[model samples]
Target chain A: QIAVVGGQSAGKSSVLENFVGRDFLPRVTRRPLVLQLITSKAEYAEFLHCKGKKFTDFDEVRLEIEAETDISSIPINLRVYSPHVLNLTLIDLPGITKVPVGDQPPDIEYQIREMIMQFITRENCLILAVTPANTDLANSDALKLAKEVDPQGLRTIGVITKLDLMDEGTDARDVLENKLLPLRRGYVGVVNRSQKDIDGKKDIKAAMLAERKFFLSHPAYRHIADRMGTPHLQKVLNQQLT
Target chain B: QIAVVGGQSAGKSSVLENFVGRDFLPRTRRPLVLQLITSKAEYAEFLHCKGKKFTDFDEVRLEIEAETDISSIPINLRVYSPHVLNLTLIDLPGITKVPVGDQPPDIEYQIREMIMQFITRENCLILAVTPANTDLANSDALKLAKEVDPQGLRTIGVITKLDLMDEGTDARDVLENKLLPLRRGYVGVVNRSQKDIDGKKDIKAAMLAERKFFLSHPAYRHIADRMGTPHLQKVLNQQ
Candidate 1:
């Protein structure tokens, strides 16, 4: 499972919505399924607790699951579900920006901090970082975070969302290429693509329409086709876990 | 005239309160100040329409004596009393964060634009940018605005309110030189003296001590001060 992270409304949800064919999580709800575990001890405990339970263990209906009931913070936890990989679970970490009030609420920051801390060890995790096309990667706080979480760079993938909005009046491909080039360099290996380019299409309107419908169909699966430039990311995740 | 702008709880109203003497304005009800201008304008016009035979020009009274009617978006001319020089009035602008379920408001930005258009051409006007010490120069949006105004040479000054918080006036000098340069560069002045530089400066304590009173001990001063910040924020956001 590839854990996707990005700024609020940076199209993290939109990416997931494109993939899963519906709102991967409710659009209005601020809380997503992603959990942040603060310390290695808490991480180990949750991992151990999850290892104790099989897929069937989470089948029963209960207000609270039996796994790590006393987790110090509610936002920090080990979520059980995954999209394609049954054994791997995707954790949606937060803490993209610490904007005053409108952009970053204190509660949201507190929750995101705890959630991002959960990724202390990303050995088996595939990290997909999402960012908006409107903002430059150099000044992006979210991109910096993805690098910090996976310094080796092999496990991290970059997905720049809202490519549909980056039209500079000339060409979408040129516009996108110019935007992703810098991020590709600073992030070591992560590269971005848009679903609009998946079929070798270049028309902005057609691409946007096609991409929207494609995302509508696959609400839980983000537009990974656009992220093809970072095939090494796919290779790293495909490799057998230690 | 000078307008003060800042985030909610940034103590913008307090800064304006400090500048404008107490008795100058009456302490009216909370909020609805921005909307009351229409009625105020009419009442004042009615008195003016009555001519000199009347006890007073309602509009003249509003322009001169009525403090509560002083809203950022005035209904009549931008200047209340045009002929009077040394006539500097402080307009308090507001907009706090959104409380869930309500629409995300931009009233502050809207009113700000209106005020900017009004004052940018009015050479007699200046802006008293009053961001709290902590938020003085941090916001990108706010910085973007400072860049656009480019009035650092003559029309703006900043007052960092709420210095009594965690970081007192310690960084006031830095903000003055850097963040507030637009204001300071224009005015070529700095005033870091806040009567209550610490959040711990209790109003009740001041009242009990009676250090210096009777600038029109208009009694409702504290209550008005408390309500002013939120009201201005709402006006800013309601846009």
Candidate 2:
């Protein structure tokens, strides 16, 4: 196992969708989604709740999770279909920004933080300190937290998200290039689709194309452009995985 | 900050040492000795070597005067500290544009030009370097970036070697950003004593010592957690 994209949960979905080069989750239905995406020729999903139940229509997968949403404290687990999907297992961990505050206790805040730390501290866990680059590297809660638990920078792969969200003329090339911030495992840069783009049902294929253009065209990233984007990010994860 | 600790001499070293929380120099001096000495030996000798053969040989010490080197590869160091922050730093040498000792008079100017090319870019989050040892008004790297980014929006104030100030005198006000403030504010970190570094003490041990330094010192205790590499990381993210 891998703990991928631990910034905000939404970014998790964004990254996962990017990995498959397609959008699947209509959205998270109030429950954490533990997604296991395997490579195959066809696409379909099998939910943990019902064995031998295959949903070729992924729209139903969204409905199923919505129906099962918050029904219990358990996380929604599914082994998803792969359509050009990279080989990997992704676990969903709730984020600090959107910790379901209802039935959660006053101590739930501490409890969730405790759970995240406990989850990541696992001896074999490879933490993807996924972060948005729209803000400063210091603002990366994912990265700072990863450093707290994995001080050596080993086991902690830095993922810089929101590459396009940066201000005009700004690119996180140095950070992404691993020149500015030194990570033993290094950093991977990615672009996520905007909410408006996603709301309009923008194609992930198109989004990925835009991502490539941004890197291949940006003055700073052009030289290293081959190393940027979700496809490259997935390739990096697979390499690190091995 | 995207930019690294910039003031020259030991200020940059101190900031990095404080971040990794360690003393890693005598062992470090070894890295330099090999390159400097190795290149000459096929005639040159490593300045930081032990059991060297040249002292008696005809090399005549490579006729020592001033030892200096320019490396194409940056010194890459990864740090793990108690007050941890995830960072990638590229440190710059001191900003003296004058003819100093034996280095080419143009060396400082080239470095100045390098800093200009980097900090002048709108993308750069310039970390103007300094130490409490110098008055806040005395920083030139800060001045350059300040002038480059007149908005004062791009510069991140750095006050390193906080403990090196006069034993009774302190730069708490400077470090705390009470006197000189940038939008990103200031970061105060303590470096291990040069003696400790000379002894080749480990940086992890030094980081532990720095944590102790911040937690126990009255002036720094209140913001220990709010300080350190982690805080610096956040303040950098604040941009």
Candidate 3:
């Protein structure tokens, strides 16, 4: 199982949608969802904690998630059997936040950290620590937490998103080129459409096209542009999983 | 006199040259000798050891480049210009850890001691330059400055490379005393890039552009008065 860990708004949901080829996940998921994708089977989804309640409509699941009052660290199991989707189990955890904002429990940071560790510390789990390209890599909470569990970076795969929004006179070129910081499994760069672009009703295909164009045209990233993007990252993960 | 201390390639030379309105310093990888820029002069003059006079800026670059030994020899540069303010500033060799070819093994300690000599004075003001793109908590200049001026009474932070900061984040977070609070506060400035230097961008025009950037930026416009080189100059002169 791949445990996707990242901070708030680090483009974790968008990357997951790109992997599953569906926009079923909400724009801002407030809870941890453990999605189990099973191939060569009938299409179905069942919640493990809700008395095995069957879910035929994803919208109902979204509403049930929004209606939840308790912010407990209970896992909401979701099983999906599709021909197009990869046969893999993925856990989308709540974004690790340093400060508890409005309406959030003061101990939210500790809760999320404990919940993430429960899955990531398992020997069979692969950790995907997502981070924004425009942020200081040293301050990444996802990477820091991952390092706490896997000190040698044996099961950690770094995913840097929002590559196009990097500041002027700076790019993640050295980071992507493995010069700035070294990782054992290495780093994979990806570009996701911003909220504005998504609001424009831009399709995933167009967003992928824009991502490719950005890497190819950028002066610092053009040389290794071919090695970037969601498709390449997907391929790398698939190969690693196999 | 004010002591400007920063990391190597942290854009210390450009800041000094821009202030004096002269490109007298050379741009090189290795560390240079101690230089003093004085505005209390009737004409521009460069005086080194043994009463030698260097008229050409290129010669000064070469002479400093050849002197690798850590000595007390100081290069006194007296500049006479209306643009130059009434100030005495010392540009110390940027700090580094590793020793290069023909350099002493204790280069780090030597540089630290040399910097202490200028900044430890009772009347000295420390201008600590740090890049905006890096974490301020790890700044070497600020760390060293705190060693002497722990109260931050004589230390002033100059955050350069504001234009190179990450998206959705700027020096405003740091300058506003939100990240790393200091008693003296922080002033943000943008220096000329390598491209700007190669293209021969006028310093006056660059200053104007910097003003425009701060005044127009949505995040910085509110505190625009505290940004840029001109504001920095005004604050230094007042101090």
- Using TM-score as the measure, the top candidate is 3
TM-score on B-chain, cand. 1: 0.45
- Cα lDDT tens digits, model 1, A9-107, are 455544433332212233222333443222121112123334564232322311123222321334324433334222334455442533334443434
* Quality class of the docking in candidate 1, CAPRI style: incorrect
Please give, for residues A1-242, the per-residue lDDT of candidate 3 as tens digits. Answer: 99999877788888877765545677655667888776645554566666657766756766665665235677777776656567678888888764344476756768888989899989989999888775657546677778788878899888998777664456788788876656798888898877677667677788888888988888888899878888888777778777
> Relative to the true structure, how large is the alpha-carbon lDDT of every model?
0.37, 0.61, 0.72
Report the C-alpha lDDT of model 3 over B1-239, residue by residue, as the tens digit.
Answer: 77888766667877776776545565533333333344444345555445565555556556656653356456666556667666777777777544454667566678788888888997988989887765564466887787788788998898887776645566677788676667888888877776677666677777777888888888888888988877877788898
Best by lDDT: 3
Segments of candidate 3 deviating more than 4 angstroms: A1-186, A194-205, A219-223, B1-186, B198-200
Instruction: Rank all candidate structures by their DockQ, best first, as comma-separated numbers.
Output: 3, 1, 2
Q: Please compute and give the TM-score of the first chain of candidate 2 against the native first chain.
A: 0.88
Each model's Cα RMSD: 20.0, 19.5, 7.5
CAPRI band for model 3: incorrect
Off by over 4 Å in 1: A18-24, A28-87, A100-111, A120-124, A149-152, A170-209, A212-242, B1-139, B142-239
In order of appearance, the predictions have TM-scores of 0.34, 0.49, 0.60
Q: Which DockQ-derived CAPRI band holds candidate 2? A: incorrect
- DockQ each candidate and list the results: 0.02, 0.02, 0.07
Task: Report model 3's chain A TM-score.
Answer: 0.88
What local lDDT does model 3 show for residue A191? 89
lDDT of 2 by residue, A1-242 (tens): 66753534326667877776655675533345678888887788888987999888767877787677731236778887776776787766655432222354434334545667756888788787776664446334576567677878878888877676554435687788787657798887888777668767789888988989988888988988887888887887788666
TM-score of chain B of each: 0.45, 0.68, 0.85
